[PDB]
Amino acid sequence: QMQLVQSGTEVKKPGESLKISCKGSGYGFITYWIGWVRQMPGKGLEWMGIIYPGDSETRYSPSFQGQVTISADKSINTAYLQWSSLKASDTAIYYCAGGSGISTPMDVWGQGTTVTVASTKGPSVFPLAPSSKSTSGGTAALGCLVKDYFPEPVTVSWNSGALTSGVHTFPAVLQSSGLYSLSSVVTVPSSSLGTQTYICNVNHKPSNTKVDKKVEPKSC
Amino acid sequence: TRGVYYPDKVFRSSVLHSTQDLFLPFFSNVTWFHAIHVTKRFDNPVLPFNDGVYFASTEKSNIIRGWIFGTTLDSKTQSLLIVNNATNVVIKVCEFQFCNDPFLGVYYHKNNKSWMESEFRVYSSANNCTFEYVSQPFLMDLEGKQGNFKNLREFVFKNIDGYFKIYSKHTPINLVRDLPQGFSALEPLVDLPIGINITRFQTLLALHRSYLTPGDSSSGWTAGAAAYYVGYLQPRTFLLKYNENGTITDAVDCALDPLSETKCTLKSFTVEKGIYQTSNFRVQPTESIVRFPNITNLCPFGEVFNATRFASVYAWNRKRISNCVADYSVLYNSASFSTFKCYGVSPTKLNDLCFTNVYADSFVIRGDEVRQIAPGQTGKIADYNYKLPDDFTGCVIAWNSNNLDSKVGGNYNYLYRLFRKSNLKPFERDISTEIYQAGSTPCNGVEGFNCYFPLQSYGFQPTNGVGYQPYRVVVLSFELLHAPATVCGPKKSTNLVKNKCVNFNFNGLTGTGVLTESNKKFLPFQQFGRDIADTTDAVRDPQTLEILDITPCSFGGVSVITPGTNTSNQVAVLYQDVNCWRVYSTGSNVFQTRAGCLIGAEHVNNSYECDIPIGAGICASYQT
Amino acid sequence: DIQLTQSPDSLAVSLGERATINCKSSQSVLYSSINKNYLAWYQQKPGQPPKLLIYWASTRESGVPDRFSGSGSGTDFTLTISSLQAEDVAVYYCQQYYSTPYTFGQGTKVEIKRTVAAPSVFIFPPSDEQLKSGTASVVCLLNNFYPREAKVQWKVDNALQSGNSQESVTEQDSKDSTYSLSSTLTLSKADYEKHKVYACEVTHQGLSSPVTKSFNRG
Ligand SMILES: *[C@@H]1O[C@H](CO)[C@@H](O[C@@H]2O[C@H](CO)[C@@H](O)[C@H](O)[C@H]2NC(C)=O)[C@H](O)[C@H]1NC(C)=O
C-alpha cells in the first residue's frame, strides 16, 4: 500500500494561477489511477477527475469539464491539478485518492489541502459582562464576542489554555456584511467570580491579529 | 446453568445475539473435591486443562489459595503461579521446580488466640522469570469458622493466542454441600500475556496446625472444610439475552434439546404451539480445517512473459493456465513494464480470491497502437485484428523490446491484417489469405488493379522513432463460471480429518460436514460433484487427490409438536423419514404414522376434531 | 449519470441498538461477467479523510470489526450496524463505481441518544464598547439541552421581533450528549433607544412552561 502525500496549504487572491501537487510514495505504484475530490465546507464530496500517471489518459466530470486541468508527471510519480484563474468560490479542501484500476473503489487517501480566496479583515473582540444578579450558589456565564472578522478561522483560547472545562465555542455565522461573528462562553460558579481573572486570546492569523482581552464584571 | 461469561466487549443493549463460543454444557458432569478433616481427604490432584476450566469454590475459611498451570511443572518448561499469600496476590511465570505436594500453612496459637501463616511450600527454585506481578498489601482473616459454607467463588480460565484470560464472580450462599442452583454471569477480571503452553493444572490449598495436631511435619496437620468443583469448556452455540442495562440475564443452550434448538432458530425464548423443523441428530461442529493447493507448481508465467518469439497480431497466441497457485509478483517492474491497466479488477487485492482459468493472450504490436488495446477503441487493430469486449475484467501488459525485434536490415516477419469485409466479434481470430475485392472486379486471386492483399508487413529499424517501435503485449483475461478449483492465490493449509462434524473450506468452497472416503471416480477435469438438491456432495482436494463425500450434520425431516410454552415444556417430535434409529432420543410412546415416526405422544383410539395437524389424517392435542 | 439517494438523513439511536442506512440507485449496477454488485460504503469522521468500509456491497476490508454488515441487491442496498458503540458517530457515504463518473451519496449523520434535559437560560446585554460603534448586539444562551427541538423568541415591550436574529447551535458534547444554542439580536442605536424591557423567552419540549429572562434598561 503506497501512501500519498499532498503539497500543502495555499492562500491566494482572486485572479491568480494555482498548481496543487499530489505526491505518490511506496512500492507497487505501477497501476494506480489518481483521482481528485473536492469537499466544500460542511458538504458532501464531489468527484472531479481521474488520470493515469504515464499514458496520461484523463477522464473528467461534466460539471468541471474544462474548468481545471489535471496532468501527471511519471518520472517523479506526481499528479498536478491546475487552475488558470481561480475565482472566489474555490475555497474548499481537496483530496487526492488513488484507485488500483478503472472501476475500483478508492482506498488510499491523501491528507488534503485547503484553499482560501479572500481579503483579510481583522477581528473586533468585545467582552460581554456577566449579569450582576445571578445564582450565587450556582453558576453564571461570561465570554467575549468576536465580530467583523474575514475569513475563517479565529482561534479563541481562554486564559492561555489554563481553563478548558465548560468552554463553549460556537461556529461562525455569516451575516449580511459578510464578516462572520463568533461567540465563546464559559460557565463559572459564583464562588470563583471574585478572584479568578479572565483573558480571552483571539488569534486571526491571516490578518496577523493576536489580542488579549480581559473579561470584566460590570457593577453599579 | 452456571458460568455464562461475557464473550465479547462490544456494549450491547436489548439485542439477542447468537454466539459460537466455549461455554459450560448445560447440566454437565463436574468433578467434586473435598478438604474435610472429620478422613483428611486433602484433595489436590493434578488435573487436565483441556480448552479452559470452570473452577468453583465453596468456602468459609479461605482454604483455596491459588493454582499452578503448566505442562510438566518440573523446571524444564515454564509454569504460571497464581497464589494468594496472607499479604499479597502474586502472579509469576518462571521455570519452577514445584513440590510434589504443594501447600500453604496456617498455624494457630493457643496461648494467644491468633492464626498466622507460617509455611510456604510450593516450589524449590524458580530461575528464568518472564512475567511478574505483585498486588498491594492486604491483611486477610485466616480465622477458622464453624458454620456452613458462606462464599461461592466462580472462575473461568482460558488460554488463547498467548493470553491467559480470567473471568470471575463472588456470591453469598448458605449451604452445606454440592454446587448450588441459579444463574450469575462472570465478569472479565484479567488478561495476562504469558505466552506458554498450559496443559495441566493443580490447586493450591492451605493447612491448619495447632496443639491438637500432634506429629512431625508430614503427619501433624488438620484440614479445615472446603470444596471445589472443576468443569471444562466445550465448543457450542448459545443465545444470550442482554436486557436494557447491558447484563446477561438469561441464556439458551442451543444443543441441549430439540426444543432449545427451535428456540435458537426462532431467536426467542418463547415458542408458540405448532410444528418447528429443528434438524436430524445435530452435532455442533467442533473443528475447522482449510485446504488449498500445495505451495509449489506455480503457473508458467515464464512461458508467457519470457519466450523466444511472440506471434503476430493477426494470429495471436492464446494459452490457458490452470491448477496452479498464481502469485502476482509480475506487477512490480522487475523488468521493463511500460503499462499496467487492469480494468475491472484490482491486482493488489486479486491475490485473496480464487479464479477459474485465467487466459493469457500474447502478440506484438507497433508503438502507437498500444492504446487501441482497450474496451471501446476504434482503429485498424481493434476492428480487424483483436477486439476486446465492452465489459472487460482483465489486465493489459505492454513493454518495449527494441533489441530483440529490430534487425538492422529490418524485421519484416511481423504482419497485420489491413483490409477486411466486416468488423470482428469479440475474441475472434480470422486467419485467412484471400484477395480482397475492393471493387467490382472479379480478379480471381491475381492481386491486380482494385484487388489487394490484406496482410502487410511491419517496418522495424533500430534507428527509428519511439512511435514506430515494437511493443510486446500480453492480455490477462479472468473469467469465473463454475468449478473454481483451478487458480487460487497462495494460502496455507492444515491437516485432514475423517468422521467428525468439522468446518471445511476446500479451494474457496466452505461448509460444515463429515468427511469420509469415497468410491466416486472423478474425471480429471472436475473437482466438485453435486447431488439432486445441487448442494456440493463431493470434493477431490489437490494435495491428496482423494474423493471425499459431504454429509450435512443432519439428513432427513424433523418437526417438533408443542402445546405452547405458556402451558408446558413437554414437546413431541416427528421424524418424517424414519419407520419405527435416526432419532435424537427414543424415550417411549413411539408411534408410527404415514407422516413419520412420532416420539413423545400417547396414541388414543378416539377420534376428535383436529387441534394440531400432524398430517395424513393424524392430529394432536394436550389433554388429561 | 446515475444519481443515488440515501435515507434517513439524521438518525438517533441509543448505545448498543441497531442502525440501518438505505442507499437507492437509479439503475442496477451488477456486472454480468462476475455477478458482483458494484457499490461501496465509506465512513468519515469530523476532520479526517474518509475510510473505506465495504466494497462490492458484501465484503469487509481488513481490520473492520464484524459489527458493520452490508446487504442488498438489485438497486436497494443497506448498511446495518448490529450494535452501535461510542466510536461510530460519523457520516456515512454510499458510492457506486460502475461507470465513470462516480456519483456519491448525500451522507448520513449517525449520533447517539440520551434522555430529555432542561436548559438553564442565560442573557447578556451589549457592553459599553458595542454602543460606540453603532450596532448593539444582545445575546441569549441556552446550555446543556437535549434534544434540539426548541425555539427562542425575543421580547421587546411585549412585541415580537422577526428577521433581525441569528442562531448558532454547537455540535454534540462528547462526554455527555447535550447541545448549547446561542441566539443573537443585532439592532442599531435607534432600535436600542426603542424601549425599556429586553427579554429572551425559550420554548423547549422537556420544559413544561416556557421560560423568561428579562433585564431592565438600567
Ligand atoms: C523473466 O526473466 C527475468 C530475468 O531473470 C525475471 O526477473 C527476475 O524475477 C525473479 C523473480 O523473483 C527475481 O528474483 C529476479 O531478481 C528478477 N531479475 C531481475 C530483476 O533482474 C522475470 O521474473 C522473468 N519472468 C517471469 C514471469 O518470472
Numbering used by the authors:
A (entry chain I): 1 to 220
B (entry chain B): 33 to 70, 76 to 617, 633 to 676
C (entry chain M): 1 to 218
Article sentences:
Trimeric S on the virus surface is thought to adopt two main conformations: closed, in which much of the RBD surface is buried inside the trimer and unable to bind the receptor ACE2, and open, in which one RBD protrudes from the trimer and can bind the receptor. To investigate how CR3022 interacts with intact S of SARS-CoV-2 we use binding and neutralisation assays and study the structure of the complex by electron cryo-microscopy.
The high resolution of the data is partly accounted for by the formation, over time, of an adventitious but stable dimer of two CR3022/S1 complexes. The RBD has rotated by about 30 degrees, the adjacent intermediate domain by somewhat less and the entire protein has extended to accommodate the Fab. First, the conformation in which S1 binds to the Fab cannot be accommodated in either the closed or open forms of the trimer.
